Every structure is written in structure tokens, then in C-alpha cells.
């Protein structure tokens, strides 16, 4: 607990990661002012589990984690405990006992292109579901059958990543959304991230 935690770096970053390669910022030894988050009206999703956001300035934690990525709007519902889908199963999984906040806002003006933004990708094939907070960035050919693929595309041998190709669509559910997930860790250790009141 010393200087202020750099939340604006996470939220106002020029570029966001692909969901399959989601970014994580580890926040330690600072004073965290969450008022800039829960007093803003720009967010379309703001859901906290195990904690109320209006109390965050009065709480202390061992560490805080800020995960950021981009997904489709109709996929934001999958960033929640117990959910399923391509994002939750193969790209970014929250734990059942999650303590934190999920914050998402429409980023069509930033991440959409008339010709499509193909810099943003998601994992489409995987042998098994991701464990909570697991990151998988491999590009190995997915083996759909029992025949080894030998790193070559073909029948039952598919590239595992697929691009969103974000465009300025008509339905908001198809547009890109930027997501920040705040995780509040509590261990048997001194607290290093505290709200200004503490």
C-alpha cells in the first residue's frame, strides 16, 4: 500500500488482447480508487460476485488481478461463474467461487473496421474445457479423430483459432466489446491492495 494502482492503464489501453490470449495485469502494493469505475455510466455490463462495487474503496486484498480482452456482445453473458459456451469453455473461464467484477463496454468505434478487424481471434476447437483462469495460446492443429494430424490441415485436422472479423454491424450483439475482469485475492498474508479509506 503506497502509490495509486494503475487502473486507467488497463481500462484506457489503446489495444486489447484477443480473448484466447487474454491479458492479465497483476496489481500489488498500492492504493486502489475504484470510484472511477462504479461512478461511470459508460459500461453496459457491471456485475460483481461476492462483493458489492460500492464497498471496494473500503476493502483490502492480498492482490488484485485485471484481465482484459475483446469478445462479441452476445458473448459477454459467458463471463460469469458456471456459464458455458465457446468463450467460457475454450477461451476464458471464471471459477465458481469467483470474487470480483466483470465490466464490459461496447467498442465498435475502436475495434470494428468496414473491411473487418481480423486482429481479434478466439479458440474454436479444443480437446477439453479450460480450467478457471487458464490461458492457452497454442496453434497446434486440432485432432478431431484418432488419426494424428502431423501438423497438416485436412479431414478431421483443423486450425483451432478463428477470427472475429469485427464489422460495424446493425445488431449490437455482433459488435466487439471490451471486457475487464477484476479478481480480488485474499490469502493468509498481509494485504497490499487497499481502498483509500483503508
Amino acid at each position, epitope marked *: 500500500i503506497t502509490n495509486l494502482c494503475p487502473f486507467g492503464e488497463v481500462f484506457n489501453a489503446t489495444r486489447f488482447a484477443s480473448v484466447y490470449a487474454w491479458n492479465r495485469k497483476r496489481i500489488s502494493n498500492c492504493v486502489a480508487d475504484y470510484s472511477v469505475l462504479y461512478n461511470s455510466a459508460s459500461f453496459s455490463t457491471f456485475k460483481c460476485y461476492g462483493v458489492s462495487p*460500492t464497498k471496494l474503496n473500503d476493502l483490502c486484498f492480498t492482490n488484485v488481478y485485471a484481465d482484459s480482452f475483446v469478445i462479441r456482445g452476445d458473448e459477454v*453473458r459467458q463471463i*460469469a*461463474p*458456471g456459464q458455458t459456451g465457446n468463450i467460457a469453455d475454450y477461451n476464458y473461464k471464471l471459477p465458481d*467461487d469467483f470474487t470480483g467484477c466483470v465490466i464490459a463496454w461496447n467498442s465498435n468505434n475502436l475495434d470494428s473496421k468496414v473491411g473487418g478487424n481480423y486482429n481479434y481471434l478466439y479458440r474454436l476447437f479444443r480437446k477439453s474445457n479450460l480450467k478457471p483462469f487458464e490461458r492457452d495460446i497454442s496453434t497446434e492443429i486440432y485432432q478431431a479423430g484418432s488419426t494424428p494430424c502431423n501438423g497438416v490441415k485436412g479431414f478431421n485436422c483443423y486450425f483451432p483459432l478463428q477470427s472475429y472479423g469485427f464489422q460495424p454491424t446493425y445488431g449490437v450483439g455482433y459488435q466487439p466489446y471490451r471486457v475487464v475482469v477484476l479478481s480480488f485475492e485474499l490469502l493468509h498474508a498481509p494485504a497490499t491492495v487497499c481502498g483509500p479509506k483503508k
Partner: antibody
Amino acid sequence: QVQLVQSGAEVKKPGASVKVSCKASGYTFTSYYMHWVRQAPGQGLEWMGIINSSGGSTSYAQKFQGRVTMTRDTSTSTVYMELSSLRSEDTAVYYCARPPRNYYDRSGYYQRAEYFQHWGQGTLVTVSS
Amino acid sequence: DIQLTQSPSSLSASVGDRVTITCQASQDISNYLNWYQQRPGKAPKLLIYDASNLETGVPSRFSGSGSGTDFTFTISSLQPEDIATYYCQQYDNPPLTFGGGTKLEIKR
């Protein structure tokens, strides 16, 4: 990979009691509420009550108050619904249903999300002599 | 308790048609209304939650609307495997209650 596996179909005499189990796997058992819903043959769905898998607190529907007891065993990740003084109207398929977690919105208000995303296969309980 | 009246009790329609069933609540229940589809002999499967949100994995042909007392549930392109009984369910106030159901049949 979430699974709710319920105990087998049973026959019970009138005036007796039945205990239906619901074993949970594939998720952190104590993180979710567990609900019980019963369906008489050819009828609609009826909500019985809710149990907190963490602390075991319960809340029952009025028409089952004093007659139903809901328990949980964290060691076996199992939820039990016990119904006593069984009558013919209690002959039904009993279901354990799991909704997602509740959450707080930006304003700090507690929001419930009681829509049942997972179900057990159900347990047919026949009340007959 | 809050009573949910579903209409119609049962109905039939051909493949490809649009179907719209309704659920009316006795009191105000905001938008805390869910729609389940129960195929014969299995447990109900959630399709719509909070009266408009499509559950993950549900085909886009399903939709819902409403807030207050009147709610509607719609299938755009009727499909052979949509044969089931549909129930609405509120959670605005305990005890949780379900609708009477709507048995949907297919013409061929």
C-alpha cells in the same frame, strides 16, 4: 461437465416419508444454491424450496412448510429433500435444479438470478399401499 | 402467491410457421420471467431468461419479450425437434411459481 444425479424411483406407503438425494459434480458444490421442483404426472411444475449449499440455510414454500426438510452434505456434494406424511397428491417426479450465482450491480444492489440452468434426471416417487 | 396464466393451453402449427405464446402474471413481476421447454419425459431445459435473454447454446429462432404483467415467447421457424410443453416461471417474489404450460404440436 456439471452433473446432478438423483436417487432412484421409489414407492412409499401413505403417511410415511421419503428422502430424495441429488449428488453434484463438475463444479464447486458450495458456490451455488440448490432448488427443488416437483411435477405430478401430467400436471405442471411446482417450486418446493431453496437451500444454501454453503451454510445449509433453507427457505420452503408455504404449502410444504413443516412437511419438507432440505439438507446438504458438503463431504459428498449431495443435497437431500425429505418429505413426510406422504399423501396421494405427493406422487410426483422430484427435481433438483441449480441456478447461477447472484451478483451485485453497479449501484450495490443484490440481484438474484433464479433461472434453472441445470437439472437432475428427476426421481419418481409413488405414494401407494 | 403470484399466478402465471399461460395461453393457449395447447396449440398446433406446421413446420416453418411463427408461433407466439403468452404468459400473464397476476401482479407486477418486472422482467424476472423465464421460459423452459420440456420435451416428453425429460427435465425442463431453460431457453429464455429474464424474459428476453437467449440462454447460451439456444438457437436464435427463439425469442421473448415483456415487462410488468404480459409476456410473449416466440419461435420464428418452427422445427421438428421443437415439440415440447413450454412453461413460464417468475422469480420476482417467493414462492417461485410456474405457468400452467403450453403444449405445442406439429402439423404434417
